Amino acid sequence: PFFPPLYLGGPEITTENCEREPIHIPGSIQPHGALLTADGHSGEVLQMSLNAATFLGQEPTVLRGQTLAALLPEQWPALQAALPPGCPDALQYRATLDWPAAGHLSLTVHRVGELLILEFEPTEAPHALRNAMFALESAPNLRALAEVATQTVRELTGFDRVMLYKFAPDATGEVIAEARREGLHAFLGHRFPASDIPAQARALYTRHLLRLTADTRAAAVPLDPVLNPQTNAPTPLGGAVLRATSPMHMQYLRNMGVGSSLSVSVVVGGQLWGLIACHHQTPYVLPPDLRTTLEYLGRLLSLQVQVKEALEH
Amino acid sequence: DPLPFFPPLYLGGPEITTENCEREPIHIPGSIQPHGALLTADGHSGEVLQMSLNAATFLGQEPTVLRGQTLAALLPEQWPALQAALPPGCPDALQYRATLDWPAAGHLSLTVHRVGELLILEFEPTEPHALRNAMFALESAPNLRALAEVATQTVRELTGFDRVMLYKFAPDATGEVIAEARREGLHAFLGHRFPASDIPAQARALYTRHLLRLTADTRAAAVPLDPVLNPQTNAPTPLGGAVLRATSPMHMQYLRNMGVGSSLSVSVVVGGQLWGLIACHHQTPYVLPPDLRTTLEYLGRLLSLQVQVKEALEH
Ligand SMILES: *C/C=C1/C(=C/c2[nH]c(/C=C3[NH+]=C(/C=C4\NC(=O)C(C=C)=C4C)C(C)=C\3CCC(=O)O)c(CCC(=O)O)c2C)NC(=O)[C@H]1C
Ligand SMILES: *C/C=C1/C(=C/c2[nH]c(/C=C3[NH+]=C(/C=C4\NC(=O)C(C=C)=C4C)C(C)=C\3CCC(=O)O)c(CCC(=O)O)c2C)NC(=O)[C@H]1C
Secondary structure (H helix, E strand, O other), rough: OOOOHHHHOOOOOOOOOHOOOOOOOOOOOOOOOOEEEOOOOOEEEEEEEEEHHHHOOOOOOHHHHOOOHOOOHHHHHHHHHHHOOOOOOOOOEEEEEEEOOOOEEEEEEEEEOOOOEEEEEEEEOOOHHHHHHHHHHHOHHHHHHHHHHHHHHHHHOOOOOEEEEEOOOOOOOEEEEEEOOOOOOOOOEEEEEEOOOOOOHHHHHHHEEEEOOOOOOOEEEEEEEEEOOOOOOEEOOOOOOEEOHHHHHHHHHOOOOOOOOEEEEEEOEEEEEEEEEEEEOOOOOOHHHHHHHHHHHHHHHHHHHHHHHHOOO | OOOOOOOOOOHOOOOOOOOHHHHHOOOOOOOOOOOOOEEEEEEOOOOEEEEEEOOOHHOOOOOHHHHOEEEHHHHOOOOHHHHOOEEEEEOOOOOEEEEEOOOEEEEEEEEEEOOOOEEEEEEEEEOOOOOHHHHHHHHHHHHHHHHHHHHHHHHHHOOOEEEEEEEEEEEOEEEEEEEEOOOOOOOOOOEEEHHHHHHHHHHHHHOOOEEEEEEOOOOOOOEEEEOOOEEOOEEEEOOOOOOOOOHHHHHHHHHHHOOOOOEEEEEEEEEOEEEEEEEEOOOOOOOHHHHHHHHHHHHHHHHHHHHHHHHHHHO
């Protein structure tokens, strides 16, 4: 099963109970964005991140009464149609708001049962993606495909280190390709145990395909209330990219000397084949539109891995 | 019966009838569609060899001036990028794309690929979260039918085409329309089946390697390359990888007879075989700009993946 989260007086996490940390319900988010939850029917704002006032420019109480209808007039019917009751928690809808306080915000919404989860992040506003797609497809074998993928991602993102991290049948991992800035250790060829990416994280990574830690020294921002009014239970944040990263996992990034980290799941035959895995030495908020490019690349790599593995077997 | 290609018309080959269907060398027509321009150049020196006859009007230069310069001089910023992206021996399927600001012609999209020692350069005029939203909707579709319907509707919304169909191949290479989105008033093609020579054998092989092709105006005359043969080889210039390549006169007649002014399709490729086609029709001529066509190319790949996934959920 899982332990209760901390804020419901559950046990603190060690290296003895790695498999039972409820990484999906931390009750908090990373501070480079803001999150609201809301009722599926009424559009009634039920929870907000204590930092919402910053991003939205709204007097705190104003929000926690109001309706999405009021708050987001153009958007609220689109949401209603895009995310019908009963849809999967994996389905997401995005829009760009030109919002008074903040030039442009990206809005990302998904639905978990009766709750809409809304994420707001700063945003903005060429051929590198098309060029990359063809490059991946003409790679002659899996090894070269891995090399092209890591190089392409590094060029698109500027990340200090990009790796392709492949799982063995027992969930033992192996860096099979790596693109990195001069003057970093090389992780190429190394293997790491199956507990470094525990079971409940690999399950979540099979369904929700992209996660990041923008700053491995930043404090999480609580949800208020912490419990969902609807249920008097924890809000599932598994499909939110703003969800706070497991403190166990930021301590391993800090010990590695990483200040920022991103990963894309590569999913083949319904299973987690591997990860595109990025490091930055310093804090780094990759903007939403560039993340989208990596999300596309994730799908394309998933296709090409199968194609390429089929021409060996 | 499978038989080798006839020589093209310009090398004294025969004209095409319903008899010798499968023998038209559709990849070497010696000509392009008039909404863009094409140059060929030597892959090592960058000497310009062939150009479409309309090139002066896209590029704003006399032929003899174009042909008298190397790509190093014509494309000083792109020439080194081309050479890195398209190394000798690379496959003909690999494409490099850039946007140019050309004085006379505005923003041009440049698409380049390499066939042996030849570079092929295509120039076309070029111009929010719809793709991301579509990607997730496709993935959440519960079964093959719902996927097919979401895919057709999405493509129609992105493009404005009068008709978008998912055309699936059976094992005998007959195809059938399994989903479609269509303009009000058009008759349905849903559930209709069509004989295997409707899209013949030398075209299904090409459609497995080069995944997008179009006919922007089913009545437009093709524009010859000049000279017609590659001076490197005194042989035909391979154009199967060029979206501008002229369309077969046999296929253009079939579309005209159906009342179609513009046609486009993306290949859906599963396990190395051509599974199907995202086929679009428009009743009037219609040019879809290169950046919009890129969205369809990306959806072609997504759909190939999702078709595998939906079919595996099915035994
Ligand atoms: C007691 C549990 C431990 C643990 C937990 C844990 N790990 C993740 C996610 C990841 N762990 C990774 C480990 C590595 N990073 C590397 O660079 C290498 C090798 C070169 C390894 C082996 C990786 C890559 C991930 C994926 C996420 C990412 O890319 O940032 C989680 C889930 C975190 C979350 O969802 O927020 C958890 C709970 N890791 C351990 O090492 C042990 C001590
Ligand atoms: C003897 C010659 C014949 C012939 C040749 C031919 N056909 C193609 C390509 C296509 N034919 C298609 C036929 C259909 N159009 C539809 O709308 C439907 C069903 C609703 C069918 C069955 C299609 C869809 C294509 C693909 C191109 C496209 O999407 O428009 C070619 C190749 C063209 C080229 O590569 O330039 C050729 C040579 N087709 C015949 O029916 C006979 C007359």
